Every structure is written in structure tokens, then in C-alpha cells.
Amino acid sequence: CHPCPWEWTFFQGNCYFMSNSQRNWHDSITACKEVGAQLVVIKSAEEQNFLQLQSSRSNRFTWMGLSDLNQEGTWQWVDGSPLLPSFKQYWNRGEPNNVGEEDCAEFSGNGWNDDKCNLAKFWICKKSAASC
Numbered sequence: 001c002h003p004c005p006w007e008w009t010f011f012q013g014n015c016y017f018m019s020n021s022q023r024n025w026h027d028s029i030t031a032c033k034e035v036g037a038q039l040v041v042i043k044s045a046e047e048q049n050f051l052q053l054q055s056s057r058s059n060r061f062t063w064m065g066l067s068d069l070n071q072e073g074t075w076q077w078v079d080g081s082p083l084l085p086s087f088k089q090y091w092n093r094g095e096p097n098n099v100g101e102e103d104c105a106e107f108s109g110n111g112w113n114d115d116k117c118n119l120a121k122f123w124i125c126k127k128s129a130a131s132c
């Protein structure tokens, strides 16, 4: 038994998969479901800080499970949950700007950015860690 699958990362009871290949936003959702997970939905500042740190060091644009596809300007997590006021401090300066229609969120540098959902980027899946 192992709390997390090979190549995954453990943090506060959950396992994260930082992909080494790229996919557009929708295909990233599917990629995570296929491994019993979900395109990362952040539920805490602690989690956000942990993820942001790993992603900035990776120097890779990375998708998260957040979008405003349904209603422009209203960002919602893939778990149907709404983006809380306390998390809006994480957007990069000048973001989200919806330039050229950007409805999917990614980790970019030290914060978040909204980008075109059809662009291929790395992605992070999240699932609960096993105990033993």
C-alpha cells in the first residue's frame, strides 16, 4: 500500500498528479477522471501556496479546475463550487483579462492567469490519498 500512486505528490491527505504531457482544458478534465481524479479544485490557501510553489518551480503553464465558461466573469470550480473572495487575491497583475476570450484558469509564474481553453498546457489532477 502507498498513500499516493507512483509519480504523484502527497499534500494534506490528497495526491496530486503534475502531468509531463500537455492537453487543452477539457481533455485535462477527462485525463483526471480516467485516473479516478479531478482537475485540481483548490479548497485552501495552504493548498494554493503549495501548488503555486510547485508550479512556479516547474516553469510550466498548468491548468487547474477553474473556468468562467458558463458565465463570463463568474469563475467556478469543476466541482460546481464557486470561487471564493479570499482566493481572488491569487490572480496575476492585470488578470483575469479575458483577452481574445479566455475562460480557463492556469498557474502562471507566481499566480493565476486566464487563458484560451483550447490551448494545450500541463495539468494537475487531485484525489484523496489512501491510508495505511
Ligand SMILES: OC[C@H]1O[C@H](O[C@H]2[C@@H](O)[C@H](O)[C@@H](CO)O[C@@H]2O)[C@@H](O)[C@@H](O)[C@@H]1O
Binding pocket: 061, 095, 097, 099, 102, 107, 108, 113, 114, 115, 116
Ligand atoms: O506571454 C505571457 C503569457 O502568455 C499567455 O497569456 C496570455 C493572456 O492570457 C495574458 O493575459 C497576457 C498578458 O499576461 O499574455 C498572453 O496574451 C500565457 O501563456 C501566460 O501563462 C503567460 O504568462
Ligand SMILES: [Ca+2]
Binding pocket: 068, 069, 072, 101, 102, 103
Ligand atoms: Ca467567455
Ligand SMILES: [Ca+2]
Binding pocket: 068, 069, 072, 073, 098, 101, 102, 103, 104, 114
Ligand atoms: Ca473569461
Ligand SMILES: [Ca+2]
Binding pocket: 095, 096, 097, 098, 099, 102, 113, 114, 115
Ligand atoms: Ca489572461
